[PDB]
Design a protein around this ligand. Structure first.
Ligand SMILES: *Cc1ccc(S(=O)(=O)N2CCOc3ccc(F)cc32)cc1
Ligand SMILES: *Cc1ccc(S(=O)(=O)N2CCOc3ccc(F)cc32)cc1
Ligand SMILES: [Cl-]
Ligand SMILES: [Cl-]
Ligand SMILES: [Mg+2]
Ligand SMILES: [Mg+2]
Lengths: 9, 227, 227, 9
């Protein structure tokens, strides 16, 4: 599914 | 970038992010790494943001082209998918090369070493997404090995709410589900990570709580999709 | 792209658009133009879409950097704005060079010739956005001259609802407002274009009506912003 | 203000 984004947004 | 000052490369990477010029950002951060000094926390984030955005765009394009190619089955769709795939592999090889020369070997603190080993797992994972056959096997194992070393350090050296530890677990769980054909391992890891973080939230400030709960929600979003 | 077939370049430009790979798209369409044959309606649109998206991203980045630079007033912000500016100018020069060698001179039908002269006006307009001083003057006049020739042909050869005629008027009105310091000319052109198109809608099919009214709404949106 | 987009969307 989703992995960690580059920034909190 | 050999003739530009380290501090100027860092400054320009920040400007490039603001301008949404991620290829430039990545080139500036590659130049900064190649100065040979260790990276601070903030500088590690600039490096990761730059390459995650570059490779993220390549991955999205590869998936569009791969879908068209599969539906088709002239040479043009395959040739163009191959072109995008080679470019993607080249960016992953570049990032892995920075980590191997010499970011990981100089990283002694748990925060830095876990961060870089998580990156190593991620870029081998992106290589595995486009790999076939036996090449796939050794690439998959390289991702697994990097994530596993990062997990072992994180569990010994970081609290269960640490955002790097949480993001590592999130990404390793995605590896298990999407790459390793291990959905039960993926679900188990995400659940145990979420629950252990929940039990440690009471120790955190308001700002740390916000960070940890944001990543916990990403773990929960995956669990909802997978169950 | 000299060794790739024209038809393969066109096919790959369409794939690149689907994959949101606009730099690739533009390179494929440059290669197609350089085969030396005229472009069909659909091929002209691929060329325009590709370069409009590439230069549109450069313009947005230049505006971010220009804003930071103006607020600041080390050399890094100016140096990086200059780098983006030079890249943008290079893309505009490339498009203008394709139009001059030899798309415009071979375009005899009103639809093709107006399309290319509108493009010429647009890429000189993008050059004018970043130009200073006396360079600005000759660049501004080059945009004006191209748009004016396109307008003269469009008014003689196309109905007032033709989408190319409408988009040309829209863009020339933006030129007047944003580049030429002629807001009254901009408003007058947009109003007269809108009203003359309105009076011709009765002649159109449902699908042509949808196209013409879409661009009329863009003219109206500008008039609402400017009045 | 706005110029013409590349595609109707
Ligand atoms: C791999 C990784 C995990 C966490 C961080 S961060 O703490 O610096 N950060 C930036 C990345 O996205 C985030 C989402 C949510 C959050 F709370 C923090 C972050 C960096 C790298
Ligand atoms: C300069 C120009 C104007 C119109 C066209 S189009 O008719 O092919 N088209 C594509 C571009 O965006 C559009 C918006 C609304 C519309 F009705 C048609 C178009 C192409 C170039
Ligand atoms: Cl060290
Ligand atoms: Cl001709
Ligand atoms: Mg120095
Ligand atoms: Mg041929």
């Amino acid at each position: 599914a989703g992995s960690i984004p580059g920034r909190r947004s | 970038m050999g003739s530009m000052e380290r501090a100027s490369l860092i400054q320009k990477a920040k400007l490039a992010e603001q301008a949404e010029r991620y290829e430039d950002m990545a080139a500036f951060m590659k130049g900064a790494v190649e100065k040979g000094e260790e990276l601070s926390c903030e500088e590690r984030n600039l490096l990761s943001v730059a390459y995650k955005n570059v490779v993220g765009g390549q991955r999205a394009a590869w998936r569009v082209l791969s879908s068209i190619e599969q539906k088709s089955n002239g040479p043009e769709v395959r040739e163009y998918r191959e072109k995008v795939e080679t470019e993607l592999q080249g960016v992953c090889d570049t990032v892995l090369g920075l980590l191997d020369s010499h970011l990981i070997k100089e990283a002694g603190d748990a925060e830095s070493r876990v961060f870089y080993l998580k990156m190593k797992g991620d870029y081998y994972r992106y290589l595995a997404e486009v790999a076939t056959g036996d090449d796939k096997k050794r690439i998959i194992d390289s991702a697994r090995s990097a994530y596993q070393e990062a997990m072992d350090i994180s569990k010994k050296e970081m609290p269960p709410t640490n955002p790097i530890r949480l993001g590592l677990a999130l990404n390793f769980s995605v590896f298990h589900y999407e790459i390793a054909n291990s959905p039960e391992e993926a679900i188990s890891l995400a659940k145990t990570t979420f629950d252990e973080a929940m039990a440690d939230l009471h120790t955190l400030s308001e700002d740390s709580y916000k960070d940890s709960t944001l990543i916990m929600q990403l773990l929960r979003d995956n669990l909802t999709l997978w169950t």
